[PDB]
């Protein structure tokens, strides 16, 4: 319900679980889909850190 | 590079790879030649 503000964004921390990447084209429609490095469309195949 | 990217960009990056590697194999044939010249002129002298 809330987010942050300019100066104090959150950082947040994820590992060791899953993340279903497939269930994307499912929300409303992200007007920015800009992927730099990647390629988004259907490749959450890699293992990151 | 494959499994990571798409076509229209994979293509360029290949096509920098390709190049490089193309240069640097007509550098080594030329080397090659120039010293097989030498080594048939030593070896014509031998004979003589």
Known sequence: ?49 | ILSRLDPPEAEVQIDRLITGRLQSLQTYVTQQLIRAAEIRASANLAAT
């Open chain 1, 1 to 49: 319900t809330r987010f942050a503000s300019v100066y104090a964004w959150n950082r947040k921390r994820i590992s060791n679980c899953v993340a279903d990447y497939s269930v994307l084209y499912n929300s409303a429609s992200f007007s920015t889909f800009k992927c730099y490095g990647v390629s988004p469309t259907k490749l959450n195949d890699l293992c990151f850190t």
